[PDB]
Amino acid sequence: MLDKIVIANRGEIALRILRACKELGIKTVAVHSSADRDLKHVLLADETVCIGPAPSVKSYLNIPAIISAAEITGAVAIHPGYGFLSENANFAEQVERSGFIFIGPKAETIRLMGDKVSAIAAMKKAGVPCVPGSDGPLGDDMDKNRAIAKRIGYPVIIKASGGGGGRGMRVVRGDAELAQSISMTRAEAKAAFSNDMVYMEKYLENPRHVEIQVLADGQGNAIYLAERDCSMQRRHQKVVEEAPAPGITPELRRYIGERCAKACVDIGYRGAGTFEFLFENGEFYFIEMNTRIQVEHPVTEMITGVDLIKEQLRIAAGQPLSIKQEEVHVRGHAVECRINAEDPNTFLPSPGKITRFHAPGGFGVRWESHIYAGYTVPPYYDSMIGKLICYGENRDVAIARMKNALQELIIDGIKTNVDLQIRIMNDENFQHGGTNIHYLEKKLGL
Ligand SMILES: Nc1nccc(-c2csc(N)n2)n1
Ligand SMILES: [Cl-]
């Protein structure tokens, strides 16, 4: 087992990783900004290193500082969590060059998945279903671009190759808007990523977001751990996630899961990963792969019994997966509600000091959060302050328990989205299940 690791993150996920480390007897190094000295995981960590001031550029994105913390403490590995540097291939490369273990895939694999065009080519080659598209980057020949659009059939969508998470895309419904849509997407990608490559896909009108969890070890084993529906979104940001996805049969699960595991073998994948699909009219279409552990991982843990963070750590140590595919069984149902410190009218972050706090408890109730009474939510980081996950023997019980747990949750002193989450749990269409990626914004009239 790894002797000591740097937790290169903050907030709830840093605490999540710390718990897993403690269970495995792994010593912890909590690197933190000057604004995060009183983070719960920092207070629980074996060693702490202040890596810079509050702004993330000088702390959680500061590659030299993080690697230096690993060096000075005698750590052997770095867990990047999610966000920050977790999808930064150059960071992974530098970590390995510096002689530490990066808890994730090989840097080349991170780079492959960060290039959406290259990622799609790889998945298509491996037999994973993808969205009908350009199968390559678009050039500047608008005669050619119109021909590609005609072959796919309007409506289409232009996407940045160096992008992700539904950001910076534009839908095109006819030739008259194609040139400008391509140009603008290109320009925005260049300004954001210094990478102006774009591609084209068929635009699906009302898909659901269904993603497959995988794990692959360095012994050649690769397994899938069912799926999650993450269709409840605002501005492409997930709000509620659940597992399994309503309406997905064991046969469909097996079909798509096997193709994802096969792809992992083909590309030499290692660690946790997520294959994101659009699901419409009973069909899956791959859009992108995330190589990190994700925010919504706990719903998969609840329904499979597999501790995904511990598996990440085992894999990085050179241990084989603790479970085989035939030992993975979907049991029950889990829902996750993200808890955000946000204004209910503007949806802007709402930082400040928590004056009273009380967490829900009970059978099937799992609360993932670093917050506590008297804790100050800083303005410098993401609005998500916790995650409430409820498990039941079926979907209805999971929803019932979430309703009850949301009512017990007290977070005073700052504005949160608890009341919105209560509204979503009471939504008749959510209760029926299978709502699409546009539903929440439609409900809210946004
Ligand atoms: N191709 C297609 N059609 C509809 C929606 C999307 C989409 C939404 S967010 C994302 N990454 N892709 N992609
Ligand atoms: Cl994530």
| Structural domains of the chain, with CATH | 1-85 (3.40.50.20), 86-130+204-444 (3.30.470.20), 131-203 (3.30.1490.20)
165 annotated as belonging to a binding site for a ligand: yes
**What's the token pair of residue 279?**
């699901």
* Of residues 434, 365, 113, the one with CA closest to residue 264: 113
The token pair that represents 51 in the structure block: 């890596």
Which letter, b or e, does each residue of 349-381 get, where b requires 16 or more Cβ atoms within 10 Å of its Cβ?
Answer: bbbeebeebebbeeebbbbbbbbeeebebbebb
Contact 320, 221 (CB under 8 A): yes
Other residues' Cβ atoms within 10 Å of the Cβ of residue 275: 27
- First-to-last alpha carbon distance for the chain, in angstroms, is 49
Tell me which ligand sits closest to the C-alpha of residue 157.
1
Residue 247 is classified by DSSP as T
Ligand 1 in contact with 201 (CB < 6 A)? yes
Residue 13: what are its φ and ψ, rounded to 5°?
Answer: -70, -35
- Asked whether 31 and 49 are in contact (CB, 8 A), the reply is yes
Q: 153: burial class by Cβ within 10 Å (0-12, 13-18, 19+)?
A: exposed
Phi/psi of residue 378, nearest 5 degrees: -70, 160
Backbone dihedral region for residue 263 (phi beyond 0: left; psi -120 to 50: alpha; all else: beta): alpha
225 with 253: CB under 8 angstroms?
A: no
333 is in an annotated binding site: no
- Position in ligand 1 atom list of the atom nearest CA 288: 11
- Name the maximum alpha-carbon separation found in the chain: 62
From CA 296, how far away is CA 278, in angstroms rounded?
A: 17
Number of other residues whose CB lies within 10 A of the CB of residue 111: 19
Residue of 201, 206, 210, 438 to test ligand 1 pocket, by largest number of atoms within 8 Å of CB: 201
For tokens 């509600």, the residue is: 337
Does ligand 1 lie within 6 Å of residue 368's CB atom?
A: no
Strand order in the sheet with 47-52: 47-52, 27-33, 4-7, 77-79, 101-102
The DSSP bridge pattern shows strands 376-377 and 283-290 to be unpaired
Q: Which stretch of DSSP H or E encloses residue 5?
A: strand 4-7
Cα distances from 278 to residues 53, 130, 138, 146, 263, in angstroms, run 40, 9, 22, 24, 17
The H-assigned helical ranges of 194-245 are: none
413 phi-psi bin (left φ>0, alpha ψ -120 to 50, beta other): left
| CB neighbours of residue 311 within 10 Å | 24
The rounded Å distance from CA 251 to ligand 2 centre is 27
Q: Which of 259, 255, 252, 262 is nearest to 221 (CA)?
A: 262
Distance CA 172, CA 182 (A): 9
For residue 433, give the nearest of 302, 338, 364, 333 by alpha carbon.
333
For the chain, the residue count is 446
> Hey, which bits of 235-353 come out as E strands?
237-243, 271-280, 283-290, 333-340, 352-353
Both tokens of residue 237?
Answer: 């940001």
- Among left, alpha and beta (phi > 0; psi -120 to 50; other), residue 13 is alpha
183 Cβ contact list (under 8 Å, min separation 6): none
User: What does the alpha-carbon distance between residue 209 and residue 229 come to, in Å, rounded to a whole number?
Assistant: 6
Which one of 287, 288, 290, 440 would you pick to mutate in the ligand 1 pocket, going by the greatest count of ligand atoms within 8 A of its CB? 287
Task: Report d(CA 121, CA 367) in Å as an integer.
Answer: 39
Distances (CA, A) of 120 to 22, 112, 131, 288: 38, 9, 9, 7
Q: Within 10 Å of residue 192's Cβ, how many Cβ atoms?
A: 13
Close Cβ partners of 100 (under 8 Å, ≥ 6 residues apart): 6, 67, 70, 75, 76, 77, 78
Active site residue 292: yes
Q: Is 209 annotated as a binding residue?
A: yes
CB 429 within 8 A of CB 385: no
Phi, psi for residue 52 in degrees, rounded to 5: 155, 180
DSSP-derived 3-state class of residue 109: helix
DSSP code of residue 414: S
